[PDB]
Amino acid sequence: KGKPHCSRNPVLVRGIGRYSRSAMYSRKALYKRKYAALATVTKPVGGGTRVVKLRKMPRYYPTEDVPRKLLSHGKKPFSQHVRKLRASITPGTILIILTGRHRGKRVVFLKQLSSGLLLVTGPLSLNRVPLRRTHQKFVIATSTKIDISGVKIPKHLTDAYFKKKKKYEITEQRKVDQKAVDSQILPKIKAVPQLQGYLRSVFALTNGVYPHKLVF
Amino acid sequence: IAHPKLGRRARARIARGLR
Amino acid sequence: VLKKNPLKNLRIMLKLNPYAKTMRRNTILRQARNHKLRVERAAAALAAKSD
Amino acid sequence: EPYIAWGYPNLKSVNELIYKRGYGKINKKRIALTDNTLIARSLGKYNIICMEDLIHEIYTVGKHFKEANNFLWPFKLSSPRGGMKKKTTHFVEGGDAGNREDQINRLIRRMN
Amino acid sequence: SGRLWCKAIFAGYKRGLRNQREHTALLKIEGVYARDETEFYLGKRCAYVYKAKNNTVTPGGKPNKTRVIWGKVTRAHGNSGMVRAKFRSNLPAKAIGHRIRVMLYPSRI
RNA sequence: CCCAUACCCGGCCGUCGCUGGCAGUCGGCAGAGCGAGAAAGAGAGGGACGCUACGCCGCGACGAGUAGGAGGGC
RNA sequence: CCGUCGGGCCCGGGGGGCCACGCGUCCAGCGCACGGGGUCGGCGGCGAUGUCGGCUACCCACCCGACCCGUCUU
RNA sequence: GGGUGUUACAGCCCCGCCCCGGCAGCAGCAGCUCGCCGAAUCCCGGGGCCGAGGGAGCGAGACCCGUGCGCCGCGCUCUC
């Protein structure tokens, strides 16, 4: 009985609480709270009534089996991992795609999906890139930002929305939400001079241009 | 208290400590 | 048993020396406390520059 | 003295050595000191029942230094990262051998 | 619409003087000529692109004659910009002095 | 800053050592244990694998070699 | 008499941290994890007449290494 | 340029009292004027190589037969 209180002591550094166990003892007020002290189923038949044993014995046994592995602890499935993100990449940043068929295209970053990929979109009206997932590792974070704190991106779209289903035809759902968020960033990118022209141009390396030497 | 044999009667107040 | 470095790995050290937790609980509160007393002087030094 | 390079170990140098490179000679077997019961199982008759007890008996040379020090397997350090000045000559003449009194700590931080 | 890889030269194998360790290659990335500016390229994926006689399948394309040997820049080498690289297959010696690409996509920026 | 077959960490092979462990596969005649710093008793009034024991398994350390010696060769 | 961020669980008396919590009398459950050696309850491509795989074994090329064995002999 | 000399229209050095004259600061982000360190030390990040081993048991217990996140170790919450 009771609504649980949040963890009383705050984390100081990973694995080290801020309060010692004696201060933790008085903080929980524990000093005043000392505590002292299926398989069988019967069915009727038209005979008598039979008792079925659910989950009956296996009717086959392989010639050989493998033994069970030992127990590890720090190994979680991918859905439970912690999702990092570069400090340079912040919502409103302009990125540069490197791997996918949109090489070099300068796109605008919106949000990071739970799966870990970035929900990026260059304005499809400019660089021909729709709402598209992208891995943060294969992008360059340009130091030019726009303020998209006033855009209401739909929450119905997620990593499951962009998952490859199974010839590919664009759904009407893909089109409608496309113009929905594009109609809110295009008025913002046009506020910055020559920005829409910067998004149409692709990134490329020319003679004497050295990535380690240049900042972006 | 930490002695295994001659600490048995010593670490018995601890049984009543959490109670 | 794969020997894990007690210096790197925190909880391996506490398995050998449980006092290392409070050793390291301090030298965090202490350093942070010494760090704010450091900036409180630099904030009071500027209050001596214009004054 | 042409074959060794000794000095006076710092407290921190004793800590890192025992913790990172500390292996016990249990039943004539080089066994890694992974938990205190390995020490108490052998050094219990000298009230040495933890790593701190062993480090204290080593650092402040105690009444049972011999048994405690002979419990440790010889430390197998790596080659000194950063190189050596000269292995063949004495420390005072620009080499590495001999007694480098308190500078042994800098050498331990690189070998450990 | 343009180049998206850095230019590098397969200088040689990691070697002493009378022994060579072909499992590691020494690269000379164009532009960088000191250690303190190689750290941008550490971990970057590098490829040795070449073309052979028979046609090979191509990811996202129809069979052409070009093949690759993928690798990655492991650590800085020497003191003047060279860098070590390890490939999934030891580079062939006929590549000494030829162009290998240093991509950017394992990027840390 | 460069690299040896040296040193450190890890994998695998073998040898040596522990003269190590395993007959306990003790099942409705059932009760699932001996990793435990501390001379000695969990004492009475339907259930994978395994153990050619000349087998199987676990820890450590170690490995140059002519003349020569010995062992093992499914 | 003076000095010591002294030693005495910092002798005793008149804001921050403690691996400190019962009485009297005599002198237990739920989870999280830097925790006894890696997992994903994460994905993407190309595949029927020219592609895929094939350490090894056929040929060839290149880099590094590399003097011809037996023997008597320091 | 040369000579003279004692502060003159620049300075440098030494000595006494000035609370070690007073004040920041401190082996200094004037990121380099000169050290040795860390029980008087911690936090965060990046690159590289590797993942060997595979029946560790937990809990209802003889009033019950289930369950394969289980040892040690750290501290979460609930029965205020």
XYZ file of C-alpha atoms (C1' of nucleotides) in Angstrom:
735
model
C 0.000 0.000 0.000
C 1.299 3.401 -1.044
C 2.507 5.471 -3.937
C 6.294 4.930 -4.099
C 8.545 7.914 -3.520
C 11.324 8.559 -6.001
C 14.814 7.409 -5.065
C 15.711 9.645 -2.146
C 19.433 10.012 -2.719
C 20.498 11.455 -6.084
C 23.200 9.795 -8.131
C 26.526 11.572 -7.699
C 28.613 9.666 -10.228
C 27.536 6.447 -11.929
C 27.238 3.833 -9.209
C 27.886 6.179 -6.269
C 24.978 7.706 -4.407
C 25.276 11.074 -2.745
C 24.415 9.910 0.786
C 26.119 7.290 2.924
C 24.136 4.304 4.137
C 23.752 5.757 7.621
C 22.459 9.055 6.269
C 20.363 6.906 3.944
C 19.073 5.056 7.004
C 17.795 8.194 8.720
C 16.573 9.584 5.402
C 14.234 6.639 4.842
C 13.111 7.107 8.471
C 13.812 3.394 8.857
C 14.767 3.905 12.517
C 11.059 4.135 13.376
C 9.887 1.427 10.969
C 11.315 -1.821 12.316
C 9.429 -4.788 10.840
C 9.218 -7.937 12.961
C 7.448 -11.173 12.086
C -2.346 -25.928 -12.056
C -1.663 -28.525 -14.754
C -4.661 -30.811 -14.198
C -8.007 -29.850 -15.754
C -11.163 -31.957 -15.479
C -13.440 -31.925 -18.518
C -16.846 -33.549 -19.076
C -17.471 -35.930 -21.972
C -20.539 -37.802 -23.190
C -17.709 -42.403 -20.491
C -17.656 -39.983 -17.578
C -15.389 -36.982 -16.976
C -11.776 -36.953 -18.145
C -8.840 -35.096 -16.617
C -6.650 -33.505 -19.277
C -3.017 -32.799 -18.404
C -2.122 -29.607 -20.240
C 1.332 -29.266 -21.812
C 1.762 -32.989 -22.362
C 5.156 -34.704 -22.635
C 7.094 -34.182 -25.881
C 6.443 -36.831 -28.501
C 9.964 -36.704 -29.951
C 13.486 -36.556 -28.591
C 16.507 -35.529 -30.673
C 19.439 -37.925 -30.614
C 21.663 -35.259 -29.051
C 21.127 -31.908 -27.353
C 23.312 -28.950 -26.428
C 23.836 -27.977 -22.773
C 22.536 -24.695 -21.435
C 24.957 -21.805 -21.462
C 26.189 -20.011 -18.359
C 24.666 -16.799 -17.025
C 25.999 -13.358 -17.908
C 24.650 -10.073 -16.652
C 25.603 -6.976 -18.601
C 24.083 -8.106 -21.897
C 20.764 -6.458 -22.759
C 18.790 -6.664 -26.006
C 19.100 -3.828 -28.488
C 15.742 -2.344 -27.516
C 17.007 -1.742 -23.973
C 20.319 -0.090 -24.844
C 21.048 3.522 -23.960
C 20.998 5.840 -26.965
C 23.905 8.268 -27.204
C 24.068 11.375 -29.395
C 26.859 13.761 -30.332
C 26.742 17.086 -28.538
C 27.167 18.828 -31.888
C 23.928 17.322 -33.223
C 21.007 19.261 -31.741
C 17.476 19.572 -33.182
C 17.683 22.198 -35.899
C 21.165 21.267 -37.023
C 21.999 20.812 -40.689
C 23.718 17.529 -41.481
C 25.519 16.062 -44.477
C 24.551 12.563 -45.575
C 27.549 10.395 -46.408
C 26.468 6.847 -47.229
C 22.927 6.511 -48.565
C 22.004 7.322 -52.159
C 21.613 10.927 -50.985
C 25.387 11.402 -50.803
C 26.479 14.917 -49.955
C 22.949 16.279 -49.639
C 22.590 18.812 -46.827
C 19.535 17.918 -44.778
C 17.889 19.310 -41.648
C 17.824 17.272 -38.450
C 14.586 17.078 -36.455
C 14.756 14.460 -33.691
C 16.409 11.236 -32.611
C 14.263 8.120 -32.747
C 14.065 5.561 -29.962
C 15.846 3.007 -32.136
C 18.798 5.423 -32.166
C 18.599 6.699 -35.736
C 18.050 10.359 -36.555
C 14.741 11.516 -38.003
C 16.284 13.802 -40.552
C 14.648 15.602 -43.452
C 16.022 18.001 -45.948
C 13.050 19.850 -47.348
C 11.853 17.519 -50.104
C 11.062 20.708 -52.017
C 14.795 21.530 -52.035
C 17.124 18.527 -51.876
C 14.622 15.770 -52.736
C 14.983 14.009 -49.369
C 11.784 12.936 -47.577
C 11.263 12.189 -43.919
C 14.012 9.605 -43.585
C 15.848 7.773 -40.833
C 19.618 8.098 -40.750
C 22.345 6.699 -38.525
C 24.185 9.398 -36.600
C 27.547 7.776 -37.250
C 27.365 8.328 -41.014
C 26.612 12.084 -40.908
C 28.699 15.229 -40.523
C 27.313 17.810 -38.103
C 27.519 21.235 -39.723
C 27.743 24.201 -37.351
C 24.726 25.978 -38.885
C 21.487 25.744 -36.930
C 17.902 26.845 -37.400
C 15.386 27.140 -34.576
C 12.732 24.432 -34.839
C 11.441 24.756 -31.288
C 8.089 25.791 -32.763
C 7.433 22.808 -35.040
C 4.964 20.120 -33.972
C 6.252 16.979 -35.663
C 3.647 14.182 -35.594
C 4.013 11.599 -32.859
C 2.243 8.901 -34.873
C 5.463 8.510 -36.867
C 8.290 6.575 -35.246
C 10.956 3.981 -36.026
C 8.138 1.522 -36.692
C 6.677 3.956 -39.226
C 9.848 3.931 -41.337
C 10.598 0.213 -40.971
C 10.888 -1.485 -44.357
C 7.714 -3.484 -44.896
C 8.502 -6.466 -47.116
C 8.378 -2.537 -55.954
C 7.954 0.351 -53.520
C 5.141 2.869 -53.901
C 4.841 5.985 -51.760
C 1.795 5.749 -49.514
C -0.610 8.646 -49.196
C 0.338 8.738 -45.514
C 3.971 9.368 -46.438
C 2.901 12.293 -48.612
C 0.498 14.033 -46.231
C 2.810 14.251 -43.213
C 5.674 15.211 -45.535
C 4.084 18.535 -46.453
C 2.901 18.869 -42.848
C 6.369 19.349 -41.370
C 7.772 20.868 -44.561
C 5.160 23.630 -44.304
C 6.632 24.561 -40.924
C 10.387 24.496 -41.647
C 10.338 26.152 -45.078
C 9.013 29.431 -43.583
C 11.890 29.179 -41.102
C 14.737 28.336 -43.480
C 13.706 31.187 -45.778
C 14.266 33.607 -42.895
C 18.008 32.921 -43.218
C 19.461 34.475 -46.400
C 20.904 32.071 -48.987
C 20.008 29.126 -46.756
C 17.569 27.485 -49.157
C 20.242 27.748 -51.827
C 22.689 26.149 -49.415
C 20.407 23.146 -48.970
C 20.074 22.598 -52.714
C 23.844 22.376 -53.142
C 25.634 19.106 -52.434
C 28.813 18.669 -50.441
C 31.988 17.643 -52.235
C 35.757 17.649 -51.821
C 37.871 19.599 -54.292
C 41.597 20.012 -54.796
C 43.378 21.334 -51.728
C 40.292 20.889 -49.533
C 41.292 18.876 -46.469
C 38.639 17.730 -43.974
C 40.945 17.798 -40.967
C 41.983 21.316 -41.931
C 38.519 22.785 -42.438
C 35.730 23.509 -39.975
C 32.042 23.238 -40.820
C 32.097 -10.333 16.684
C 33.587 -11.517 13.393
C 35.012 -14.636 15.029
C 33.144 -17.721 13.774
C 33.109 -19.772 16.983
C 33.388 -17.360 19.911
C 31.278 -14.688 18.225
C 28.081 -16.711 17.908
C 26.557 -15.270 21.081
C 27.828 -11.837 19.993
C 26.146 -11.566 16.580
C 22.723 -12.484 17.959
C 21.668 -8.953 18.894
C 21.874 -8.357 15.141
C 18.995 -10.817 14.680
C 16.890 -8.479 16.819
C 18.433 -5.431 15.143
C 16.462 -5.530 11.906
C 13.368 -6.703 13.803
C 38.085 -16.186 -13.042
C 38.860 -13.355 -15.442
C 40.812 -10.845 -13.371
C 39.101 -7.477 -13.705
C 41.172 -4.428 -12.835
C 39.989 -3.082 -9.460
C 41.362 0.335 -10.352
C 39.260 0.688 -13.496
C 36.273 -1.411 -12.451
C 34.509 0.220 -9.519
C 32.497 -2.625 -8.036
C 35.402 -5.035 -8.255
C 37.235 -2.681 -5.907
C 34.319 -2.576 -3.473
C 34.349 -6.370 -3.514
C 37.937 -6.174 -2.224
C 37.845 -2.908 -0.254
C 34.347 -1.720 0.691
C 35.805 1.444 2.204
C 36.786 2.653 -1.267
C 33.155 3.675 -1.763
C 33.318 6.309 0.962
C 36.854 7.230 -0.048
C 35.374 8.022 -3.446
C 32.134 9.455 -2.103
C 34.394 12.076 -0.607
C 36.951 13.500 -3.081
C 33.784 14.185 -5.055
C 31.822 16.238 -2.557
C 35.156 17.709 -1.487
C 36.336 18.604 -4.980
C 32.963 20.036 -5.974
C 32.915 22.008 -2.732
C 36.456 23.246 -3.311
C 35.512 24.063 -6.897
C 32.652 26.374 -5.966
C 34.769 28.113 -3.338
C 37.207 28.670 -6.194
C 34.681 30.468 -8.398
C 33.217 32.384 -5.462
C 36.578 34.125 -5.139
C 36.848 34.847 -8.860
C 33.310 36.212 -8.637
C 34.383 38.267 -5.621
C 37.637 39.262 -7.325
C 35.685 40.952 -10.109
C 33.694 42.676 -7.359
C 37.102 43.998 -6.292
C 38.076 45.047 -9.822
C 35.257 47.542 -10.360
C 35.359 48.564 -6.681
C 73.262 -3.529 -9.099
C 74.076 -3.772 -12.845
C 71.082 -6.079 -13.278
C 68.346 -4.406 -11.224
C 66.754 -0.998 -10.848
C 65.384 -0.523 -7.353
C 64.126 2.358 -5.277
C 61.737 3.312 -2.522
C 58.116 2.598 -3.448
C 55.462 5.216 -2.797
C 52.179 4.341 -1.119
C 50.282 4.776 -4.373
C 52.825 2.567 -6.120
C 52.112 -0.189 -3.609
C 48.374 0.218 -4.188
C 48.485 -0.095 -7.969
C 50.934 -2.996 -7.886
C 48.947 -5.118 -5.437
C 45.635 -4.287 -7.066
C 46.443 -4.504 -10.762
C 49.338 -6.977 -10.821
C 48.746 -8.819 -7.561
C 48.801 -12.610 -7.783
C 49.012 -14.910 -4.785
C 51.017 -18.112 -4.459
C 48.322 -20.490 -3.260
C 49.328 -24.160 -3.239
C 52.279 -23.302 -5.497
C 49.869 -21.907 -8.088
C 49.853 -18.339 -9.366
C 46.251 -17.386 -8.584
C 44.836 -13.919 -9.157
C 43.726 -12.095 -6.010
C 40.100 -11.652 -7.021
C 38.477 -11.692 -3.578
C 39.515 -11.401 0.045
C 38.862 -15.054 0.896
C 41.919 -15.994 -1.152
C 44.079 -13.929 1.196
C 42.404 -14.921 4.452
C 42.631 -18.576 3.416
C 46.430 -18.268 3.520
C 47.316 -15.142 5.508
C 44.543 -15.454 8.079
C 46.922 -16.708 10.759
C 48.523 -13.242 10.706
C 45.255 -11.245 10.837
C 45.701 -10.380 7.145
C 42.184 -10.948 5.835
C 41.847 -8.366 3.044
C 43.824 -6.491 0.419
C 44.136 -3.481 2.709
C 45.601 -5.679 5.430
C 48.122 -6.989 2.918
C 48.942 -3.533 1.574
C 49.395 -2.244 5.112
C 51.664 -5.148 6.015
C 53.736 -4.445 2.904
C 53.948 -0.656 2.972
C 54.635 -0.264 6.684
C 56.987 -3.225 6.919
C 55.251 -5.285 9.561
C 55.945 -8.170 11.877
C 54.736 -10.552 9.154
C 56.250 -8.909 6.083
C 58.138 -12.068 5.149
C 55.104 -14.346 5.010
C 52.999 -11.636 3.385
C 55.613 -10.721 0.787
C 56.376 -14.365 0.062
C 52.655 -14.877 -0.517
C 52.757 -12.539 -3.499
C 53.934 -13.997 -6.746
C 56.731 -11.898 -8.288
C 55.120 -9.031 -10.165
C 55.264 -9.475 -13.925
C 55.465 -5.914 -15.166
C 55.364 -4.900 -18.798
C 58.164 -3.185 -20.665
C 58.445 0.477 -19.665
C 56.209 2.591 -21.873
C 58.285 5.568 -22.938
C 61.584 3.730 -23.121
C 64.618 3.721 -20.886
C 67.562 6.087 -20.708
C 70.195 3.349 -20.858
C 69.864 -0.187 -19.552
C 73.572 -0.921 -19.333
C 74.847 1.859 -17.053
C 74.038 3.060 -13.552
C 71.263 5.554 -12.911
C 73.553 8.287 -11.605
C 75.634 8.238 -14.788
C 72.606 8.638 -17.046
C 71.549 4.991 -17.186
C 68.808 2.949 -15.586
C 70.411 0.384 -13.276
C 71.057 0.846 -9.589
C 69.229 2.790 -6.917
C 67.023 5.557 -8.202
C 65.651 6.131 -4.694
C 62.329 7.883 -5.112
C 62.297 7.986 -8.913
C 61.328 4.308 -8.880
C 57.726 5.506 -8.753
C 57.881 7.159 -12.165
C 59.251 3.893 -13.508
C 56.437 1.914 -11.903
C 53.721 4.111 -13.411
C 55.122 3.263 -16.849
C 55.806 -0.433 -16.292
C 52.570 -1.132 -14.422
C 27.997 14.996 -57.506
C 31.535 15.141 -56.174
C 34.335 13.347 -54.364
C 33.552 12.236 -50.821
C 36.777 10.492 -49.829
C 40.234 11.665 -48.876
C 43.211 10.832 -51.061
C 45.798 8.499 -49.552
C 48.804 6.559 -50.808
C 49.668 2.989 -49.883
C 53.204 3.794 -48.790
C 54.208 0.322 -47.671
C 53.787 -2.437 -45.148
C 54.579 -2.015 -41.491
C 58.129 -3.289 -41.377
C 61.386 -3.128 -39.535
C 64.249 -3.179 -41.975
C 64.633 -6.880 -42.829
C 61.171 -8.032 -41.741
C 57.805 -6.817 -42.942
C 54.431 -7.394 -41.307
C 52.000 -7.498 -44.200
C 48.971 -7.515 -41.920
C 49.333 -3.748 -41.417
C 49.642 -1.040 -44.052
C 51.221 2.404 -43.842
C 49.215 5.208 -45.412
C 50.186 8.714 -46.473
C 47.044 10.819 -46.455
C 47.371 13.864 -48.677
C 47.345 17.108 -46.732
C 48.258 15.858 -43.270
C 51.960 16.015 -42.414
C 52.157 15.775 -38.613
C 50.795 13.584 -35.836
C 48.780 16.325 -34.146
C 46.483 16.477 -37.188
C 46.033 12.751 -37.852
C 43.531 12.207 -35.040
C 40.718 13.241 -37.368
C 41.384 10.169 -39.501
C 41.652 7.603 -36.703
C 38.950 4.984 -37.055
C 37.907 6.195 -40.494
C 37.109 3.504 -43.037
C 39.565 3.216 -45.924
C 39.186 1.221 -49.127
C 41.496 -0.007 -51.857
C 39.430 0.112 -55.043
C 40.734 -1.793 -58.047
C 39.317 -3.415 -61.154
C 39.886 -6.969 -62.343
C 39.041 -9.056 -65.402
C 35.923 -10.967 -64.370
C 32.696 -9.227 -63.431
C 31.719 -9.115 -59.764
C 28.385 -8.351 -58.134
C 28.024 -4.797 -56.866
C 25.942 -3.732 -53.847
C 23.144 -1.590 -55.230
C 24.090 -2.039 -58.859
C 24.710 -4.437 -61.686
C 27.984 -6.405 -62.032
C 30.971 -4.299 -63.036
C 34.680 -5.087 -62.966
C 35.581 -3.087 -59.846
C 36.424 -4.748 -56.527
C 37.499 -3.424 -53.132
C 39.410 -4.384 -50.013
C 37.921 -2.653 -46.994
C 39.991 -1.448 -44.079
C 40.161 1.107 -41.294
C 42.721 3.605 -40.047
C 43.906 2.151 -36.751
C 46.470 4.545 -35.289
C 48.945 7.251 -36.178
C 52.345 6.163 -37.434
C 55.658 7.899 -37.174
C 55.836 11.592 -36.495
C 55.021 13.295 -39.796
C 51.449 12.428 -40.695
C 51.679 8.800 -41.815
C 49.046 6.485 -40.382
C 48.544 2.763 -39.952
C 45.649 0.925 -41.518
C 44.425 -2.644 -41.223
C 42.487 -4.276 -44.043
C 40.262 -7.342 -44.057
C 42.801 -8.884 -46.437
C 46.473 -7.905 -46.513
C 46.910 -5.447 -49.348
C 48.568 -6.843 -52.473
C 52.076 -5.603 -53.075
C 51.129 -4.319 -56.497
C 49.290 -1.543 -54.705
C 52.448 0.073 -53.283
C 52.251 3.678 -54.401
C 48.656 3.648 -55.629
C 45.575 5.521 -54.507
C 43.405 4.183 -51.717
C 40.385 6.116 -50.529
C 39.845 7.290 -46.961
C 36.118 7.807 -46.506
C 34.540 9.951 -43.806
C 31.458 8.066 -42.673
C 32.704 6.479 -39.389
C 32.746 10.187 -38.471
C 33.130 11.530 -34.938
C 31.909 15.073 -35.559
C 59.162 8.561 -33.035
C 60.548 3.334 -35.328
C 60.723 -2.486 -34.137
C 62.858 -8.593 -31.863
C 60.659 -14.840 -31.621
C 62.370 -10.183 -25.415
C 58.229 -8.138 -21.697
C 52.590 -7.428 -20.775
C 47.155 -8.960 -21.954
C 44.209 -12.608 -24.794
C 43.331 -17.182 -27.911
C 44.933 -22.216 -29.212
C 48.455 -26.748 -28.992
C 51.536 -29.778 -26.041
C 54.374 -31.090 -21.681
C 54.895 -30.941 -16.553
C 52.808 -30.149 -11.802
C 48.639 -30.272 -8.357
C 51.163 -37.873 -6.816
C 43.995 -32.283 -8.228
C 38.421 -33.443 -8.983
C 34.475 -37.393 -10.608
C 31.766 -44.409 -8.592
C 26.726 -39.137 -5.816
C 23.328 -41.103 -12.434
C 22.648 -41.470 -3.745
C 14.636 -39.884 -7.487
C 6.859 -40.647 -4.506
C 11.918 -46.879 -0.524
C 12.563 -39.395 -3.982
C 14.159 -34.148 -1.625
C 17.854 -31.528 -5.806
C 24.120 -29.658 -0.684
C 29.441 -29.468 0.619
C 33.419 -22.126 -2.436
C 33.789 -22.785 3.364
C 39.525 -17.578 6.368
C 39.224 -20.399 11.555
C 40.740 -28.866 15.251
C 35.532 -31.472 14.054
C 27.985 -34.119 12.830
C 22.895 -30.544 7.354
C 24.159 -37.837 13.340
C 20.540 -40.631 16.470
C 17.912 -41.242 21.642
C 7.861 -36.334 -13.715
C 13.613 -34.626 -13.701
C 19.463 -32.681 -20.117
C 24.603 -34.432 -20.519
C 27.843 -37.972 -18.312
C 31.806 -42.354 -16.164
C 36.044 -46.434 -23.853
C 37.908 -44.852 -14.792
C 43.775 -47.115 -19.959
C 37.780 -42.462 -19.104
C 36.198 -37.525 -18.372
C 37.049 -32.831 -16.104
C 39.533 -28.194 -13.417
C 43.362 -25.165 -12.168
C 48.532 -23.279 -12.520
C 53.406 -22.961 -14.484
C 56.311 -23.956 -18.681
C 58.142 -25.030 -24.397
C 65.962 -23.682 -28.025
C 68.852 -28.082 -29.203
C 73.791 -31.322 -32.080
C 76.051 -36.130 -29.943
C 72.974 -39.016 -26.927
C 68.760 -41.100 -23.966
C 63.434 -42.169 -23.323
C 58.218 -42.132 -24.348
C 53.858 -42.073 -27.585
C 52.446 -43.362 -32.597
C 44.007 -44.785 -34.720
C 57.120 28.574 29.609
C 56.369 28.286 24.038
C 55.291 25.738 19.477
C 51.991 21.217 16.780
C 45.517 21.902 10.674
C 50.108 16.436 16.912
C 48.352 11.625 20.023
C 44.619 9.945 23.474
C 37.536 5.784 18.513
C 40.374 14.319 18.518
C 40.999 13.471 27.306
C 37.166 15.757 29.805
C 33.692 19.953 31.080
C 30.238 24.361 30.132
C 26.742 23.732 9.128
C 28.333 19.004 7.715
C 29.001 13.700 8.310
C 28.748 8.582 11.171
C 29.051 0.412 8.202
C 25.288 4.354 14.979
C 18.951 2.804 16.620
C 15.474 -2.173 20.340
C 13.850 -3.521 25.963
C 15.334 -5.066 30.817
C 19.025 -6.525 34.530
C 24.015 -6.979 37.045
C 29.207 -4.986 37.500
C 10.630 -10.310 4.738
C 9.468 -9.308 -0.592
C 10.104 -6.536 -5.499
C 13.281 -4.636 -8.918
C 18.426 -1.870 -10.731
C 23.193 -3.206 -11.803
C 31.066 -0.811 -13.514
C 28.870 -7.516 -9.926
C 31.722 -15.606 -10.911
C 34.867 -14.300 -19.776
C 28.898 -11.389 -25.299
C 24.858 -10.447 -26.477
C 20.955 -8.096 -29.422
C 13.654 -9.926 -27.466
C 18.857 -4.965 -33.910
C 19.171 -4.387 -39.126
C 20.491 -4.017 -44.798
C 21.681 -5.848 -49.641
C 22.280 -9.299 -53.781
C 21.231 -14.834 -55.712
C 19.166 -19.429 -62.523
C 22.548 -18.731 -66.721
C 26.149 -15.985 -64.833
C 26.646 -14.995 -60.675
C 28.067 -16.707 -55.336
C 31.536 -19.675 -52.237
C 35.781 -22.870 -52.624
C 42.133 -22.168 -46.795
C 44.234 -25.698 -49.442
C 45.932 -27.766 -54.732
C 47.215 -25.385 -60.966
C 49.575 -21.191 -63.210
C 51.182 -16.083 -62.889
C 52.487 -11.316 -60.686
C 54.329 -8.236 -56.841
C 56.684 -6.928 -51.669
C 59.901 -8.918 -47.806
C 62.939 -12.968 -46.664
C 66.173 -16.427 -48.785
C 73.886 -19.102 -50.770
C 73.509 -26.523 -51.818
C 72.579 -30.653 -49.721
C 75.228 -34.938 -47.204
C 79.836 -34.969 -44.284
C 84.412 -34.703 -41.199
C 85.430 -30.266 -38.530
C 87.040 -25.068 -33.390
C 79.850 60.093 -31.043
C 83.376 61.939 -26.594
C 84.027 63.794 -21.646
C 82.017 65.067 -16.951
C 78.903 62.815 -12.943
C 74.661 60.371 -8.830
C 68.844 60.957 -10.655
C 68.016 66.064 -12.755
C 63.193 65.952 -17.627
C 65.291 58.016 -17.331
C 66.308 54.222 -14.361
C 69.141 50.107 -11.709
C 71.203 48.171 -6.784
C 71.662 47.813 -1.351
C 70.111 49.085 3.934
C 66.580 50.471 8.152
C 61.981 51.205 10.060
C 57.094 50.732 7.826
C 52.321 44.186 11.468
C 57.031 39.102 7.086
C 54.260 47.298 5.110
C 49.397 46.229 2.916
C 46.594 43.649 -1.049
C 44.859 39.931 -5.097
C 47.018 35.369 -6.448
C 49.822 31.023 -5.782
C 54.299 25.874 -8.244
C 48.922 30.495 -11.786
C 44.684 29.973 -18.190
C 49.853 36.089 -18.369
C 47.329 27.554 -21.206
C 55.545 27.565 -20.987
C 59.498 31.935 -15.595
C 61.640 27.379 -12.710
C 59.670 21.436 -9.159
C 58.437 16.811 -6.876
C 53.941 14.539 -6.196
C 48.391 12.163 -5.074
C 44.951 7.561 1.155
C 47.581 15.015 -0.175
C 42.605 12.207 -6.875
C 38.887 12.231 -9.128
C 35.386 12.999 -13.435
C 34.382 12.690 -18.663
C 35.666 11.391 -23.817
C 37.998 9.133 -28.227
C 40.678 5.137 -31.399
C 42.423 0.096 -31.708
C 42.304 -5.583 -30.661
C 39.478 -9.416 -28.271
C 34.767 -12.048 -26.388
C 37.903 -17.739 -24.327
C 34.195 -20.531 -21.249
C 28.817 -22.830 -21.297
C 23.561 -27.320 -16.144
C 26.453 -21.147 -11.393
C 20.560 -22.662 -9.990
C 16.924 -19.790 -7.382
C 11.809 -21.170 -4.197
C 6.974 -24.106 -2.168
C 9.557 -27.494 0.548
C 8.030 -34.288 2.611
C 1.540 -29.263 4.583
C 5.055 -29.237 -2.128
C 6.744 -30.403 -7.557
C 7.075 -24.690 -9.688
C 10.576 -21.794 -12.001
C 15.722 -21.174 -15.648
C 18.176 -13.247 -14.285
C 21.476 -17.262 -10.367
C 26.809 -16.454 -6.508
C 29.468 -12.725 -4.224
C 29.357 -7.471 -4.057
C 26.793 -2.067 -4.539
C 22.132 0.480 -2.957
C 16.464 1.029 -5.272
C 11.601 0.895 -3.726
C 7.353 -1.083 -0.714
C 5.065 -3.235 3.955
C 5.264 5.145 8.114
